[PDB]
């Protein structure tokens, strides 16, 4: 009955902090939520490990996709803080110590979302809400307009810590552990988040240390399940969603004189795989000469299985992460060390795959 002009969402999962403790669960939380929002006809873009410039750019491009009637969801998984009722998200490049200037203000984002006349504004912040001692600054953000459509789902309470599970390899954080079981329901997002809070109050590991906090002002019965108002083939549904369509362009399966495959893990995380397509005793397929921007290590490249590269879910797999850092076209060498005869020859073919996923932007 209530309808969405469009349903767009942004997910940011910071783990690899340069001067702060490292998290491991924001990978699976962002992967799992992206899939659930896609099930709910949402157009999504998930990005792991972003710096201040990258986070601000991904937030600035999320605002272009928004317009009157659109449903805008922002999920954040990683380090954060709350100073005088203002929540901030900490990027991986933020120093130690840090202030407001280094982090993105969740509140400012909502102000810019309001200017675009959004029909629903959701913010699920899966971060710690503990105070920052160094942050002395206190800006007076000019009071948000009364839109009656803002839902905030914080993984923890003010001055409390949001936790992740250590035990498993694909272990979820407390918030996503419960949210995944309830997200697909056809209830109002406030009602949906209420059910999550009850399930959370049934975990003995979270008692007294993590409770869900919901701030809301939503007056209409709006849900993530809400249908899109128009066809996805109009000179409006294409113009508005043009940029999102470009950041989903996986490279075409390259043929080698060996087969090159291209898989998408996250909008900024690619995964390549070389395949073995009578006179040759043995041959080796290897991948090298990767741009110095992506900062890959040979120990983590050309692994046997995808799990050996730090990814979710017979070839030689390479996890091409941080695709946002790529400056002009991805070009790499496909080494071929074959044996006919005691001789062994080495061939190098330069494969250009263009600008894939987020790098197209």
């Amino acid at each position: 009955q209530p309808l969405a002009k469009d349903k767009v969402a942004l997910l940011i999962g910071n783990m690899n902090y340069r001067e702060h403790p490292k998290l491991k669960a924001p990978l699976v939380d962002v992967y799992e939520l992206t899939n659930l929002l896609r099930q709910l006809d949402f157009k999504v873009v998930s990005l792991l490990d972003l710096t201040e410039y990258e986070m601000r750019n991904a937030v600035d491009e999320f605002l272009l996709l928004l317009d009157k009637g659109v449903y805008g969801l922002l999920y954040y998984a990683g380090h954060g803080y709350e100073n005088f009722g203002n929540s901030f998200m900490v990027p991986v490049d933020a120093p130690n110590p840090y202030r407001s200037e280094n982090c993105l203000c969740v509140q400012n984002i909502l102000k810019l979302m309001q200017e675009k006349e959004t029909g629903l504004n959701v913010f699920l912040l899966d971060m710690c809400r503990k105070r920052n001692d160094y942050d002395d600054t206190i800006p007076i953000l000019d009071a948000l307009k009364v839109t009656a459509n803002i839902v905030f789902g914080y993984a923890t309470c003010q001055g409390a810590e949001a936790f992740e599970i250590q035990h498993s390899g694909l272990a979820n954080g407390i918030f996503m552990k419960f949210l995944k079981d309830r997200l697909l329901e056809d209830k109002k997002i406030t009602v949906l988040l209420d059910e999550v809070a009850e399930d959370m109050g049934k975990c003995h590991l979270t008692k007294g240390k993590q409770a869900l906090e919901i701030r809301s002002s939503l007056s209409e019965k709006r849900a993530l399940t809400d249908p899109i108002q128009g066809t996805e083939y109009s000179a409006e549904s294409l113009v508005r969603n043009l940029q999102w369509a470009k950041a989903h362009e996986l490279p075409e399966s390259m043929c080698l004189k060996i087969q090159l495959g291209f898989a998408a893990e996250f909008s900024n995380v690619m995964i390549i795989y070389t395949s073995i397509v009578p006179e040759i005793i043995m041959c080796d397929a290897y991948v090298t000469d990767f741009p110095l921007d992506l900062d890959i290590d040979p120990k983590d490249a050309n692994k046997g299985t995808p799990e050996e590269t730090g990814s979710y879910l017979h070839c030689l797999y390479t996890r091409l992460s941080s695709l946002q850092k790529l400056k002009e076209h991805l070009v790499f060498t496909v080494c071929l060390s074959y044996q006919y005869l005691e001789d062994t020859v080495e061939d190098k073919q330069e494969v250009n795959v263009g600008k894939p996923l987020i790098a197209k932007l």
Partner: peptide, 4 residues
């Protein structure tokens, strides 16, 4: 239990 790892804090974020």
């Amino acid at each position: 239990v790892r804090p974020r």
